[PDB]
Design a protein around this ligand. Structure first.
Ligand SMILES: [Cl-]
Ligand SMILES: [Cl-]
Ligand SMILES: [Zn+2]
Ligand SMILES: [Zn+2]
Lengths: 27, 21, 26, 21, 21, 27, 29, 21, 21, 27, 28, 21
């Protein structure tokens, strides 16, 4: 529901930083 | 996936890094 | 370049919203 | 790339959708 | 209003757009 | 309620992208 | 450039926090 | 207006308050 | 502390300033 | 602990705005 | 300077994530 | 400080770590 939706926005920002040049794909 | 995994309990940096390429 | 870095952070956030269940490529 | 497209000028949400999925 | 509609369920871009000026 | 507050932060950011030059009120 | 575009996202966030319950005026034109 | 004003130079908290309802 | 004070009941920017250096 | 984590993310943003040149410690 | 302000907002968000329970320090 | 070191050239994760307690 929305809790997971709001949390997912912070997760993709976290992956953006953590993953660096190698990147991630979300979903 | 990561949302189920890391929004139901907190993921460490090392757990987050599992979802990198 | 930090400018590109900060742009990308915002693009990730925008694609998360726009793409929904489809997910996206960054 | 997305960076030349959308970091040098503003992409519409229609333009961003190119980059889904 | 927008909190009932969009904070307890996910709103799409189109739903959100209803709230634009 | 903080959860509503935090949802508001996200809704303002999403309306900013969705609404573009027409803007929006968040009250 | 997209500077103002990125800035504006932070700016609405700041207005949201600053203004509290009464909200803010945001008609960019 | 507001983006031109506060995104060309930083607005203080007082200047941001100008835009509250 | 701040979590106790601010993570279930909203703190204004004005109550938050307590936590500045 | 995810809710307190997400609240902290928003608190850090809020403290960065209100504290200005003073800064703050979030710990 | 607006760009420094915006960069710092991102930096403190990044420190919040990276530093975990230790937290971070931040004096302009 | 961090803004001077990390606002022109990108700081990596490991560089950001230098600013943890
Ligand atoms: Cl949140
Ligand atoms: Cl930015
Ligand atoms: Zn959030
Ligand atoms: Zn930004």
């Amino acid at each position: 529901f929305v809790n997971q939706h709001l949390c997912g926005s912070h997760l993709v920002e976290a992956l953006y930083l953590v993953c660096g040049e190698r990147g991630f794909f979300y979903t | 996936g990561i949302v189920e995994q890391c929004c139901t309990s907190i993921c460490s940096l090392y757990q987050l890094e599992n979802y990198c390429n």
